[PDB]
A paper describes a structure:
The structure is composed of a β-sandwich core flanked by an N-terminal and a C-terminal α-helix. Relevant functional areas such as the lipid-binding region (contoured by a hydrophobic loop and the C-terminal α-helix) and the pore-forming N-terminal α-helix were conserved. When considering only the differences among fragaceatoxins, it is observed that FraE shared a high identity (98%) with FraC, explaining their similar activity above. The most stable isoforms were FraA and FraB as judged by their higher TM values (TMFraA = 65 ± 1 °C, TMFraB = 62 ± 2 °C), followed by FraC, FraD, and FraE (TMFraC = 53 ± 3 °C, TMFraD = 47 ± 1 °C, and TMFraE = 51 ± 1 °C). Differences in the exponential dependencies of the lag time on the protein concentration distinguish the more cooperative FraC and FraE from the other fragaceatoxin isoforms. In particular, these two proteins are predicted to have regions of larger, local intrinsic disorder, suggesting an underlying local flexibility that may enhance binding cooperativity. The overall hemolytic activities, however, are lower, implying that protein flexibility may obstruct other steps during the pore-forming process. Moreover, FraC and FraE share an identical N-terminal helix, although the hemolysis produced by the latter is considerably faster. Given the high sequence similarity between FraC and FraE, other possibilities such as long-range interactions may help to explain kinetic differences, such as those described for Stn-II. Similar mechanisms may apply to the arginine/aspartate difference at position 129 of FraC versus FraE.
The multigene family of actinoporins are a group of cnidarian pore-forming toxins produced by sea anemones well known for their widespread polymorphism. Strongly influenced by negative selection, actinoporins have conserved important functional sites to ensure the preservation of their mechanism of pore formation, a complex process involving many different steps. The steps leading to pore formation comprise (1) the binding of the toxins to the cell membrane, (2) toxin diffusion across the membrane plane, (3) protein oligomerization, and (4) translocation of the N-terminal α-helices through the lipid bilayer.
Residue numbers in the entry: 3 to 179
């Protein structure tokens, strides 16, 4: 229980991500993240940048082709009106970086769920700079209960889904172009 689980790629789906959410218990804002590695490359965890919110687990360290990683986060605990906003960075065996943005706001009167995926040339750690590119400059997807596809370059693509609520799930599949 130091890291999030690694499961058979084919196992990843809505019910797995709801089980992850349920284990966090009834906190106001929380996310279950599932990324299926069908990239044909091994991933090695770099880091998670939390702009807001926290996790009691670290990224699964090694995620082979054919494996999905499970991850989670939740709002900072106590009377702060914040959500859970951060960036996951994995190193790929080609020397590049797979980056995932998740954004779950406190106030749905004015803000909505957002996610993003991208491949960076070389070894790039998750930080505020990467958050700002993925959020403000690289056409994030809305957590609109819709599936979205994108060509990542570097011979990969993504297909993913995020729901629209404060109890958020983010399912992503990286496959071969």
């Amino acid at each position: 229980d130091v890291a999030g689980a690694v499961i058979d790629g084919a196992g990843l789906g809505f019910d797995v991500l709801k089980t992850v959410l349920e284990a966090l218990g009834n906190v106001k804002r929380k996310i279950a993240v599932g990324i299926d590695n069908e990239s044909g490359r091994t991933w090695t965890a770099m880091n998670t940048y939390f702009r807001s919110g926290t996790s009691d687990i670290v990224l699964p360290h090694k995620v082979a082709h054919g494996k999905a990683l499970l991850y989670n986060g939740q709002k900072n605990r106590g009377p702060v009106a914040t959500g859970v906003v951060g960036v996951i960075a994995y190193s790929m065996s080609d020397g590049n970086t797979l980056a995932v943005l998740f954004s779950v706001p406190y106030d749905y009167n004015w803000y909505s769920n957002w996610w993003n995926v991208r491949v960076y040339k070389g070894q790039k750690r998750a930080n505020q700079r990467m958050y700002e590119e993925l959020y403000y400059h690289r056409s994030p997807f809305r957590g609109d209960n819709g599936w979205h596809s994108r060509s990542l370059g570097y011979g990969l693509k993504s297909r993913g889904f995020m729901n629209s609520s404060g109890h958020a799930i983010l399912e992503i599949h990286v496959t071969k172009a």
